[PDB]
Amino acid sequence: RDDTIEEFATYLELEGKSRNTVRMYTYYISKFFEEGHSPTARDALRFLAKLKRKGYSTRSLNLVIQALKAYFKFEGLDSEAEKLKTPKMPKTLPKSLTEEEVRRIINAAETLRDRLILLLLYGAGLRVSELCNLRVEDVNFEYGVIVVRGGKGGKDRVVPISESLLSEIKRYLESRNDDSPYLFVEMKRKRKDKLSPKTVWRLVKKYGRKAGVELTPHQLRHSFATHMLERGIDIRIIQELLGHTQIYTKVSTKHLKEAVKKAKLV
Amino acid sequence: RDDTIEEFATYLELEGKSRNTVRMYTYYISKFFEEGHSPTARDALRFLAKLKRKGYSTRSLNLVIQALKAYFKFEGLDSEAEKLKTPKMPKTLPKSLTEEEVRRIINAAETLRDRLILLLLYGAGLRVSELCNLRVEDVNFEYGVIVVRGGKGGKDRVVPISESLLSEIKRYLESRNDDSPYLFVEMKRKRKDKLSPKTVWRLVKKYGRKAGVELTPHQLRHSFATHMLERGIDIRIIQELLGHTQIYTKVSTKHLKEAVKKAKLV
Ligand SMILES: [Cl-]
Ligand SMILES: [Cl-]
């Protein structure tokens, strides 16, 4: 019942936690279960915002959050554990890009590899790391989708793509003399390892310049968002395709079909 | 050369970083490369402790650390990236346990599963999470070792074990009607999932009480350390076996043989 919390505290002592932090965590954890909250990511938040309205600092909230998170790891509930991430400060973004601009950026590609990167980042709206990490095995030709591996503690995801894109991928894969798992690779002294985010970033500004726009990888993911919506795709599916509980997969390949996104330039 | 850093900053803006934090990171990163330091975990530290001796706060150092770490992820150098962890505050531990005490704790086991847990935590000195996560595939009967999977960003490791221990494992595995990957499992409504750290902790106090000692999982890993050394095994190998650049594997199985650790009680 409570002897657990005594144990949780020494747990933290041994993980190198400061005896005052331990004091604090233990404090809030006890309080949490005193209310009657249950060991989930929902009751965490329904406990946290009560504090917020009661007037608690940001550093104070951040601490409570991380206290709960550490506890969940201890209970072993690692599902509920990563759900608790302190939502990032939302920035406003540059104006969304147009079809004309996207066309000019795509068409600026020196190589097919570069082209496929751009086309994926936008036609599939990938994050830079999803891209940097996407293993070629995840390009599923039978269903005509990319599977975007769920990251450190996220969820797997399935982005349908066109035959046109699936074609260029084949063409490009045929052309690959290496044993690297990854869809994209950069040449080094150590021939053929994985892309960094720096590299995607360098590469995106390159073509951004040639097509005459100050550009970033995100700008492509975001125009994906915008245009999917301009086309008349309900915001929820788009919010599905993008990641960030009615889901489907033959509807995704269907609605992404009607969008004709990538096709409307290649 | 430097246009990278401009890009690194917007990188952080988009990851939701505060424009002042970005100011700071960028500040220190520039400074780092101004010295002439090279993008590694070593020159990070040879840069950090210079600051420390120049008088920089803890929160100030922690910030610089995390600035570099974020940058490395961006360069894609994820090798050097996790090497930089701010070393945990070292606690002093309870007095090391004796052979007699270890025997009494082992022998207190209700079930074979419980016994094997205790015997591993001590005879193999595992961390609680290494234990909670060890997949049964990693029990290598041909070489007579456990392979301890390197964690989130650590390194794989190989702990030799006795035939006696390898025996009980077989016996116990024969007795397993489930399809869970893991060497140890706990019964729930959701029959046969993985152990939490709470569970190992509950279980260790149980047998700790029966044998009459206030005990923790770490106390077992630590007595492993002590006794390996009492026996005359050079501290470096022990420091190898434990994890936390001359390495070997037929020397580990050899020296761990001479220790007769587990044998000296079962
Ligand atoms: Cl279809
Ligand atoms: Cl041997």
Numbering used by the authors:
A (entry chain A), B (entry chain A): 9 to 252, 258 to 279
From the paper:
Here we present the first crystal structure of a full-length archaeal Tyr-recombinase, the XerA recombinase from Pyrococcus abyssi.
Surprisingly, analysis of crystal packing of XerA revealed that two monomers, related by a crystallographic symmetry axis, form a putative dimer. The interactions in XerA are mainly stabilized by contacts between the two αK helices. The XerA structure revealed that the extreme C-terminal αN helix packs in cis into a groove located at the surface of the C-terminal domain. Within the XerA apo-dimer, positioning of the αN helix in cis prevents contacts between the αM helix and the catalytic site resulting in the exclusion of the catalytic Tyr from the active site. The conserved catalytic residues R135 and H226 of XerA are within hydrogen-bonding distance of the sulfate ion. The simplest interpretation of these results is that XerA follows a cis cleavage mechanism despite the unusual orientation of the catalytic Tyr extruded from the XerA dimer.
